[PDB]
Design a protein around this ligand. Structure first.
Ligand SMILES: O=C(Nc1ccccc1)Nc1cccnc1
Ligand SMILES: O=C(Nc1ccccc1)Nc1cccnc1
Ligand SMILES: [Cl-]
Ligand SMILES: [Mg+2]
Ligand SMILES: [Mg+2]
Ligand SMILES: [Mg+2]
Ligand SMILES: [Mg+2]
Lengths: 194, 194
């Protein structure tokens, strides 16, 4: 019943553009929205976020997260490993590659979401969330070698899955970091389950 | 180690602006980023709230209450937690309970409130509180919940059982063109993984 009529370019940078979207509301009234989009895209989604479940025998299962300076936030953020899917990459292979570049861990695909929206009220950005298990007892994940690209500076933070929410709240309280909303949502639901 | 050096306005719509952010990398080199901000954030902890609304009713399984709306940035319908911006001088909790009532008709009770968490930290400074609210669906107020949507708000309510949320989201996505929000999907995955 609602649909897009027209999009006007307001401003196009190298990575990000701003548009004025004209749309028809359900009453038949024409309305405008300021929208952000990535400047270029081919793929199912722009991206993947990886939920990396570090499994080591006789240890608590851990969720592997990353801490990086985020210039739009002006500070440090705790996030699932994540990056853009390359032209030609499957979401799954983008997931293993990012996880390896960012954390040094080599993992196994467990499941892969459909494309899900990051911030549908601002952007059109979408990602696949990819659940990956990491056999922490395997020799390749003994001394994980993080292979960061140019301009990535990633700190790795493993937290126990059974206390994730309390551990993140502790990090926020003491380290003045911002936790990512997907990470927090995941952590909440681990507590809210049954 | 890393910090912002300057923020230069590239373009400023009524609601969203684009900025060229210059920051110091951890090697001591200057880099830039393109950042999105809102134009009207007041002296508050976070822009907005998303509500995790747990509908509780005797001899019913708990439901997560979700909303479906047309999102002009996305060019389509999205399934999301009820959500909105925090008004000047409004607390996160008041905003959560008010957006929930406006969008769904339900009157909730606060359970918990997250710190400010980042929506898409490689793009914007946007942050939200994720507020968990229980809804007593046995209370007469919550019997025939009538939405009070504001001007230009057009929201459908969808209540899904907590105990099957991920499969139920998958069935909705299977039946139509519709994107699930990444927070909702992250929360449904954790419910499975617990
Ligand atoms: O790429 C973005 N987010 C993201 C990508 C991969 C994984 C996780 C998050 N947001 C964005 C950037 C530039 C223009 N519009 C939106
Ligand atoms: O408002 C935003 N997100 C949001 C707000 C409330 C609840 C859920 C999500 N993002 C945004 C908008 C304008 C400029 N930059 C970012
Ligand atoms: Cl798992
Ligand atoms: Mg990354
Ligand atoms: Mg990366
Ligand atoms: Mg809303
Ligand atoms: Mg609203």
């Amino acid at each position: 019943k609602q649909y897009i009529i027209s999009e006007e370019l307001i401003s196009e940078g190298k990575w990000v553009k701003l548009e004025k979207t004209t749309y028809m509301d359900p009453t038949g009234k024409t309305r405008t929205w300021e929208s952000v989009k990535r400047t270029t895209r081919k793929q199912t989604a722009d991206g993947v976020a990886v939920i990396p479940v570090l499994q080591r025998t006789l240890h608590y299962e851990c969720i592997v997260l990353v801490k990086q300076f985020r210039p739009p936030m002006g500070g440090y953020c705790i996030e699932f490993p994540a990056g853009l899917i390359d032209d030609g990459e499957t979401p799954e292979a983008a997931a293993l590659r990012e996880l390896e570049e960012e954390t040094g861990y080599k993992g196994d695909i467990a499941e892969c979401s459909p494309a899900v929206c990051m911030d549908p009220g601002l952007s059109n950005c979408t990602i696949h969330i990819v659940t990956v298990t990491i056999n922490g007892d395997d020799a390749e994940n003994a001394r994980p070698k993080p292979k960061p690209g140019d301009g990535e500076f990633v700190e790795v933070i493993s937290l126990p899955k059974n206390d994730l929410l309390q551990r993140l709240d502790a990090l926020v309280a003491e380290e003045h970091l911002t936790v990512d909303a997907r990470v927090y949502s995941y952590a909440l639901a681990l507590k809210h389950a049954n």
